[PDB]
Amino acid sequence: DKEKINKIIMEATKGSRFYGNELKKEKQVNQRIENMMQQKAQITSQQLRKAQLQVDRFAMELEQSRNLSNTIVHIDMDAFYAAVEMRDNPELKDKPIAVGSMSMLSTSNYHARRFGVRAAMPGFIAKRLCPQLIIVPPNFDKYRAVSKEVKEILADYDPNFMAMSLDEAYLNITKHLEERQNWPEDKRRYFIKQNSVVFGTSAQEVVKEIRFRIEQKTTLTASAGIAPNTMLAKVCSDKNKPNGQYQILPNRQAVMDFIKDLPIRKVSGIGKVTEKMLKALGIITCTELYQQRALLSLLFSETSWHYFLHISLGLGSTHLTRDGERKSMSVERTFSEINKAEEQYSLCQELCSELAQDLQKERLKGRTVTIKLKNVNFEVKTRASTVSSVVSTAEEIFAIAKELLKTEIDADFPHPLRLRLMGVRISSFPN
DNA sequence: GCGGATCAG
DNA sequence: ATGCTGATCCGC
Ligand SMILES: Nc1ccn([C@H]2C[C@H](O)[C@@H](COP(=O)(O)NP(=O)(O)OP(=O)(O)O)O2)c(=O)n1
Numbered sequence: 547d548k549e550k551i552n553k554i555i556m557e558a559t560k561g562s563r564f565y566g567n568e569l570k571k572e573k574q575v576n577q578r579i580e581n582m583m584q585q586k587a588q589i590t591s592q593q594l595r596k597a598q599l600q601v602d603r604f605a606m607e608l609e610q611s612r613n614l615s616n617t618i619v620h621i622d623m624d625a626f627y628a629a630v631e632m633r634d635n636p637e638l639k640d641k642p643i644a645v646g647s648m649s650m651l652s653t654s655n656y657h658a659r660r661f662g663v664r665a666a667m668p669g670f671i672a673k674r675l676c677p678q679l680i681i682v683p684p685n686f687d688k689y690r691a692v693s694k695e696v697k698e699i700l701a702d703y704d705p706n707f708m709a710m711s712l713d714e715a716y717l718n719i720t721k722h723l724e725e726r727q728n729w730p731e732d733k734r735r736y737f738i739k740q741n742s743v744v745f746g747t748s749a750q751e752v753v754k755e756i757r758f759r760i761e762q763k764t765t766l767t768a769s770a771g772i773a774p775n776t777m778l779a780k781v782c783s784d785k786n787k788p789n790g791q792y793q794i795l796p797n798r799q800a801v802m803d804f805i806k807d808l809p810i811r812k813v814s815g816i817g818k819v820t821e822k823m824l825k826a827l828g829i830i831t832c833t834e835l836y837q838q839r840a841l842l843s844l845l846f847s848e849t850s851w852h853y854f855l856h857i858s859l860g861l862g863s864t865h866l867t868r869d870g871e872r873k874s875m876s877v878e879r880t881f882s883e884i885n886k887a888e889e890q891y892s893l894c895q896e897l898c899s900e901l902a903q904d905l906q907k908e909r910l911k912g913r914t915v916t917i918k919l920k921n922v923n924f925e926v927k928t929r930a931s932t933v934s935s936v937v938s939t940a941e942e943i944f945a946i947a948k949e950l951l952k953t954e955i956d957a958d959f960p961h962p963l964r965l966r967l968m969g970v971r972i973s974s975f976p977n
Numbered sequence: 978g979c980g981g982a983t984c985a986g
Numbered sequence: 987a988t989g990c991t992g993a994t995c996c997g998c
Pocket residue numbers: 622623624625626627628651652653654665666711713787788986
């Protein structure tokens with residue numbers, strides 16, 4: 547159980563340098579919360595009243611603009627990496643496995659997820675939650691191929707769909723539903739790998755068709771979420787996981803019912819921290835997020851409480867925007883400790899090289915270079931430089947990064963930098 | 978623009 | 987022993 551999990555994790559992790567840095571970060575967020583409470587205390591019923599008035603005017607503007615006509619779907623491959631590793635090695639099918647290394651786990655099967663073993667967890671810890679664990683190395687190109695197959699299926703229903711990662715996507719199947727209402731039985735017929743099955747004309751049905759085709763073509767299961775906007779769809783896709791779906795019917799009441807007791811943590815954008823801060827105000831669900839809208843208008847910036855309000859009303863994008871041009875590119879690498887300056891400069895040079903190579907791949911030229919440095923106590927710092935003309939080759943990037951690094955090395959003199967990670971990043975591309 | 982931080986996958 | 991990429995946000 548949770549007690550046993552947190553117990554052995556803590557027992558095996560206590561007093562590490564990582565653990566220390568986590569205590570530091572925890573302390574800092576606690577501080578942020580302290581400040582926010584002290585700022586809550588100086589709020590008068592008056593300015594609060596004015597707040598509630600303005601906020602409600604805006605909210606009215608929102609609820610007026612609500613759109614329910616579109617059908618939005620979110621597909622999420624189940625335990626992806628691990629599912630693929632299981633598909634092609636049946637000697638694992640009934641065992642707890644994780645895709646990753648000893649350092650870090652990309653993911654785990656549900657069979658192992660029952661031991662608290664999860665993504666973003668170090669391997670050696672996961673093997674202490676579960677010593678019978680099989681850690682199988684990742685085969686990224688396979689995952690990309692399967693991804694291609696799945697996207698091929700998805701393009702049938704929404705050509706202009708939006709792929710998140712290798713295993714996630716949003717589809718706008720309004721057009722398809724429209725054209726599918728008057729579809730003969732033989733455009734909805736698929737063969738099991740003459741032996742057929744047929745699918746209906748409802749959204750629910752379109753989605754089980756897609757999931758079916760995916761299982762046939764790839765031998766892998768996916769979950770899906772069906773809702774009138776992206777936010778809602780994304781929350782849906784996780785309810786009936788794995789290999790299941792869920793629809794929110796396009797009526798305001800359904801939206802509100804689904805929302806009213808939805809934990810804020812489950813919406814995309816609200817992580818551990820924001821959850822803790824909102825929990826400090828006694829906000830856990832979206833109902834309470836709606837109630838305290840004015841208070842939030844006074845406590846948070848315009849962007850944050852606007853967002854919070856959208857969430858609390860169940861709004862979200864209903865139009866999938868074309869995957870835009872990128873805004874940054876970066877390479878970073880973790881290694882066992884590096885003290886010697888010349889080696890650090892060399893490392894920098896190499897990273898800059900790879901970066902110049904990637905920029906070359908996309909023909910990109912930018913004028914802001916940032917170096918990233920993570921020391922052995924896990925403290926991270928970045929340093930940037932924006933220059934007049936755009937930059938592209940390994941020589942230029944190294945020219946800048948070299949002197950940023952120089953600056954840090956000198957700044958710490960006569961001490962050596964004790965690095966565990968190093969990165970170089972470029973941005974400020976043209977318009 | 979800079980630097981620290983949050984979040985997702 | 988062993989803890990990547992891109993985007994955005996919050997003050998400055
Ligand atoms: N922290 C993370 C999260 C995901 N990943 C990789 C491995 C995952 O297969 C994929 C993330 O997709 P995901 O849907 O969030 N997780 P996963 O498919 O494993 O399980 P489900 O929650 O979908 O059942 O990217 C990672 O490498 N590090």
